RNA sequence: GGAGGUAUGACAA
RNA sequence: GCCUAAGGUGGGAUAGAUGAUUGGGGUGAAGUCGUAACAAGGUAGCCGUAUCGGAAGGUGCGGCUGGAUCACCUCCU
RNA sequence: GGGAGACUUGAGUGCAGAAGAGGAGAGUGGAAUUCCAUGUGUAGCGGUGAAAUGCGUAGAUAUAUGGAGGAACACCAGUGGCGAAGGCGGCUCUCUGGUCUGUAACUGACGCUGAGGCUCGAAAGCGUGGGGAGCAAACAGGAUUAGAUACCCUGGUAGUCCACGCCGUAAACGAUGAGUGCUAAGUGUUGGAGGGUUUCCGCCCUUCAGUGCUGCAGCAAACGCAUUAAGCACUCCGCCUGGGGA
RNA sequence: UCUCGUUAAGGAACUCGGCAAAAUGACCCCGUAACUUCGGGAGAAGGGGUGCUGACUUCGGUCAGCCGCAGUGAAUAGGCCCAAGCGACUGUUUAUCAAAAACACAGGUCUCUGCAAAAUCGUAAGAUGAAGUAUAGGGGCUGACGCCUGCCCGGUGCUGGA
RNA sequence: UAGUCGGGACCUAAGCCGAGGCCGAUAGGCGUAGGCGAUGGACAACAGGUUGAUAUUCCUGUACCAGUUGUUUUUGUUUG
RNA sequence: CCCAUGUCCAGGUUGAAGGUGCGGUAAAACGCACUGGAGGACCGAACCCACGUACGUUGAAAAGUGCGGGGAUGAGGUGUG
């Protein structure tokens, strides 16, 4: 649930946060933790390549089993855990043979559920099957784009996709964005939608909290100088004062499409959206 | 349920064959009221059934008032067994 | 026969 | 020395007066604009609500007959 | 009126039955509209009092085959049913309220009304998140007209739909508060019950509770009401006291 | 001239401006308005008490007495109030003449992006974005919250058509 | 003046270097294995005394850590 | 500006959510206490900052000092690499 803080301070005023009710532990699985340094938007040349990233809290990476290709044994859900690296929660599962893994927690997943993966798995939340084995109309997430590569699509909190049909070696899927496309039928997906649906409703509340979450401030181009931004300069506040608004590198910011016009996947995208 | 109703009737019957009496009626109304409350919390938009719950509550209250005005010893005995207030 | 339903124009005289 | 009237200071409470300006309302034998209602009032009217328009009002949604006319079945004399 | 008893008719429980678009949740069906794709096909289509805007040779409308999506549920359907009212109409299941009829085993006046409080409450509207076929305030264009910020036409956004939370108002009307008893008849119909016939089917009669129509007594300013009273009575509540200003 | 102390009567008449200085200052107690997002506004304001010595104590006082001009006796610890503009707020900035009404901000909205994502660094390889995946990431504008955000698509851009 | 302090003969972070490798007019750029790299991890002694100037470093007392040689004691010799 | 790894913030104050008890109720909402210890929270040293003013202006100083001033658990200060 979302808890609304009382306005004890102006910073606390209008702020909200999740009450983390679904989280059953705060002791992550040591075996599955890996270190990640904060790149702060800087690449192997040490240059800022993505603005507005850096600082904030330290994090340990939780190795998520996106492939879900262990089909022999079932895995019992042990915990629902907070994952600082993604908007969704993750579930610690113990395979009967003693192998431990993390998965994305689907909506409605509960501690104690027994999950299976493979062509013969039931159509149940948390089970992962090849798309060819999933009946049409089923809500799915964690869709892999290439066989054996692991889930890549529909992984953020509250997201879901739906199977629309089978044509050839491809399954017609509606993605979370509304786009309808073909995914290779040998690709696997997990049944259900991603949990933590309330994630989008959080009112961050104060600037410091965004800094905790590794976001550095955005400066508007209009309040820069002309040598910094096409919107820079002018006396006083100014309008855009150009044909169209542009990025710092002169690329139109309202409406101009940036997808490669010769994309290979265009053959596989049936109906676009976003 | 007629089975659950009869077994409550036998547990609280003032004597053999006593179906009607403040104790029997109140107790049966008490399990009826509890079950309908569970339904109410699951179906919070079922306003029409909730009105049935309220009439059950008022009838139970009226019978409790009659029992208290009539035999305060019985009234205290009953409310303890059913856990009322 | 009966019944519920499907543009403008004083004032008094 | 205690109590204490009056007096002084302070922040509130309460009642009337007055105030640039402002709001709708009532009045005013014969002003301007339209014609909304009363007949089916010429788009039936009215109710609540929303929205728009100089203005009466218009339009949408639901409701009412306190509905003119011709056309049906049930009912009943 | 108070106190101690007794009672069973009011009220309730039990037992046995009856009907129902009563409510909530989750699914699901066909018809139709729209859009989309593909054939066929060729210059119109659409619309009005008459027109035009609009759509169409960038191939329409029509027609065929499919696909998507939303909303509403033809026939049944009925002064028919259910609900306190607002209201409830495809079908299926799950949860759930109430009512009615017999019986007379049980309780033994436990009842009625109910200021204040609480709950529910059409439509429009509001907030957050979805959806969006059709319809359609606003709005645009075309007309009509003296003018038209209308009626008419072509479009069309909110809204209409869903979830959750607000709002709390309607010619929210039977413009008739609730409870109880009493006071001619006739005739429909919905759900019951009992009996007399009928080979059954059904018909006959008695009856309970609804729902209508007609109509005495009585009532009413009149209109009209009339066992579903606006009649004859008792209890409690709400409300009224010339019109306007409100 | 600088730095510091005291000043009769007056008390902002000074001055662009109460600049500077003065005054307030601790603790306890009484008490505390408009307005409000119901948290606040408040330490609002405005007042009272404070030393010493006995007696007595429920251990905080109370009673009584005593001295001084003065008792947080020195030092160090808010001046306050009314009202208007602007910015919601804490923050940030012109190192060295500008700390602000500027930037940022949470919130809003638009748009791009189906993942070898868009975007960016690079001739490239290789990276960042992300060991992220549309509730995510980039970009433009607006800038808490409340109520709201009307008309114009001819022009220019963008998008689609072809 | 130190087996015991701090550093090395221990460890890894960021980062850096980088066999082959990938890329590129030249130069070189990037990068795998492998390493380097503390500001972190690990790690055995203390009190007093002493000099003009050093001391947990010298000295006194009493310790600890790793290892070496020998003596005695136990037990194991390839079902160990 | 960022990365990895350390480290610093005297002392007071306020009293958010949650919890408990007792009232309240059909159950609730909810009221009152207590507990609880939130915050780019409050007062205030160190620490960081640099708002006013005087002075300095061949300076004590190529930007400071005096008296006051703001922040001071954070979008914080600061060390090492
Ligand atoms: K805030
Ligand atoms: K998370
Ligand atoms: K900005
Ligand atoms: K500018
Ligand atoms: K009219
Ligand atoms: K009605
Ligand atoms: K039933
Ligand atoms: K709405
Ligand atoms: K009848
Ligand atoms: K003077
Ligand atoms: K104040
Ligand atoms: K004194
Ligand atoms: K002070
Ligand atoms: K500012
Ligand atoms: K701001
Ligand atoms: K503002
Ligand atoms: K400042
Ligand atoms: K700035
Ligand atoms: K706003
Ligand atoms: K943005
Ligand atoms: K703009
Ligand atoms: K923003
Ligand atoms: K334009
Ligand atoms: K244009
Ligand atoms: K050493
Ligand atoms: K070290
Ligand atoms: K200074
Ligand atoms: Mg950004
Ligand atoms: Mg500038
Ligand atoms: Mg330029
Ligand atoms: Mg410019
Ligand atoms: Mg200007
Ligand atoms: Mg007229
Ligand atoms: Mg009319
Ligand atoms: Mg009329
Ligand atoms: Mg209009
Ligand atoms: Mg509505
Ligand atoms: Mg009313
Ligand atoms: Mg009848
Ligand atoms: Mg003087
Ligand atoms: Mg003097
Ligand atoms: Mg002056
Ligand atoms: Mg002067
Ligand atoms: Mg001053
Ligand atoms: Mg002093
Ligand atoms: Mg500011
Ligand atoms: Mg500030
Ligand atoms: Mg400067
Ligand atoms: Mg300055
Ligand atoms: Mg701005
Ligand atoms: Mg060492
Ligand atoms: Mg290298
Ligand atoms: Mg080489
Ligand atoms: Mg390595
Ligand atoms: Mg050591
Ligand atoms: Mg020395
Ligand atoms: Mg603070
Ligand atoms: Mg401070
Ligand atoms: Mg320092
Ligand atoms: Mg600075
Ligand atoms: Mg402050």
Curated annotation (Swiss-Prot), chain A:
Single GO BP term: cytoplasmic translation
Subunit structure of this chain's protein: Part of the 50S ribosomal subunit. Forms a bridge to the 30S subunit in the 70S ribosome.
Classification lineage: Bacteria, Bacillati, Bacillota, Bacilli, Lactobacillales
PROSITE patterns reported for this sequence: RIBOSOMAL_L2 (PS00467)
Chain positions covered by the region annotation Disordered: 33-54, 220-274
Biological role: One of the primary rRNA binding proteins. Required for association of the 30S and 50S subunits to form the 70S ribosome, for tRNA binding and peptide bond formation. It has been suggested to have peptidyltransferase activity; this is somewhat controversial. Makes several contacts with the 16S rRNA in the 70S ribosome.
Protein name per Swiss-Prot or TrEMBL: Large ribosomal subunit protein uL2
Gene3D superfamilies xrefs: 2.30.30.30, Nucleic acid-binding proteins, Ribosomal protein L2, domain 3
Family: Belongs to the universal ribosomal protein uL2 family.
Origin: domain of life: Bacteria
Pfam families referenced in this protein's UniProt entry, alphabetically: Ribosomal_L2 (PF00181), Ribosomal_L2_C (PF03947)
NCBIfam families: rplB_bact
PANTHER family: LARGE RIBOSOMAL SUBUNIT PROTEIN UL2M (PTHR13691:SF5), RIBOSOMAL PROTEIN L2 (PTHR13691)
GO cellular component: a single term: large ribosomal subunit
UniProtKB/Swiss-Prot annotation, chain B:
Molecular-function GO terms, alphabetical: rRNA binding; structural constituent of ribosome
Compositionally biased residues, Basic and acidic residues: 1-18
UniProt keyword annotations, A-Z: Ribonucleoprotein, Ribosomal protein, RNA-binding, rRNA-binding
GO-annotated biological processes: translation
Highest taxon in the source lineage: Bacteria
Pfam families: Ribosomal_S15 (PF00312)
Region (Disordered): 1-21
Matches recorded under CDD domains: Ribosomal_S15p_S13e (cd00353)
InterPro entries in alphabetical order: Ribosomal_uS15, Ribosomal_uS15_bac-type, uS15_NS1_RNA-bd_sf
Gene Ontology cellular-component terms listed: cytosolic small ribosomal subunit
Subunit-level organization: Part of the 30S ribosomal subunit. Forms a bridge to the 50S subunit in the 70S ribosome, contacting the 23S rRNA.
Record's function text: One of the primary rRNA binding proteins, it binds directly to 16S rRNA where it helps nucleate assembly of the platform of the 30S subunit by binding and bridging several RNA helices of the 16S rRNA. Forms an intersubunit bridge (bridge B4) with the 23S rRNA of the 50S subunit in the ribosome.
Similarity field: Belongs to the universal ribosomal protein uS15 family.
Record protein name field: Small ribosomal subunit protein uS15
Organism from which the protein derives: Enterococcus faecalis (strain ATCC 700802 / V583)
């Amino acid at each position: 649930a979302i808890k609304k803080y009382k306005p004890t301070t102006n910073g606390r005023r209008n702020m909200t946060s999740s009450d983390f009710a679904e989280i059953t532990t705060s002791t992550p699985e040591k075996s599955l933790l890996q270190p990640l340094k904060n790149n702060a938007g800087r690449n192997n040349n040490g240059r800022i390549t993505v603005r507005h990233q850096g600082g904030g809290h330290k994090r340990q990476y939780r190795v998520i089993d996106f492939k879900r290709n262990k089909d022999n044994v079932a895995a019992v859900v042990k915990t629902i855990e907070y994952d600082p690296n993604r908007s969704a929660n993750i579930a610690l599962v113990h395979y009967e043979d003693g192998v431990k893994a993390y998965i994305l927690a689907p909506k409605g997943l509960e501690v104690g559920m027994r999950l299976v993966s493979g062509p013969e798995a039931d159509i149940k939340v948390g089970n992962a099957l090849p798309l060819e084995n999933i009946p049409v109309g089923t809500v799915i997430h964690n869709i892999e784009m290439k066989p054996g590569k692991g889930g890549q699509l529909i992984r953020s909190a509250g997201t879901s996709a739906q199977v629309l049909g089978k044509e050839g070696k491809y399954v017609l899927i509606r993605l979370n964005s509304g786009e309808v496309r073909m995914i290779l039928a040998t690709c696997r997906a997990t049944i259900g939608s991603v949990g933590n649906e309330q994630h989008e409703l959080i009112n961050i509340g104060k600037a410091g909290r965004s800094r905790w979450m590794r976001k550095r401030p955005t400066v508007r181009g209009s309040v820069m100088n002309p040598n910094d931004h096409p919107h820079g300069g002018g006396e006083g506040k100014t309008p855009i004062g150009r044909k169209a608004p542009v990025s710092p590198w002169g690329q139109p910011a309202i409406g101009y499409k940036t997808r490669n016009k010769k994309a290979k996947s265009d053959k596989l995208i049936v109906r676009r959206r976003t | 349920s007629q089975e659950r109703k009869n077994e409550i009737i036998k547990e609280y019957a003032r004597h053999e064959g006593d179906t009607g009496s403040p104790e029997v009626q109140i107790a049966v109304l008490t399990e009826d009221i509890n079950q309908l409350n569970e339904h109410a919390r699951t179906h919070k938009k079922d306003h029409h059934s909730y009105r049935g719950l309220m009439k059950k509550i008022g009838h139970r209250r009226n019978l409790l008032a009659y029992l208290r005005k009539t035999d305060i010893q019985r009234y205290r005995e009953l409310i303890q067994r059913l856990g009322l207030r």
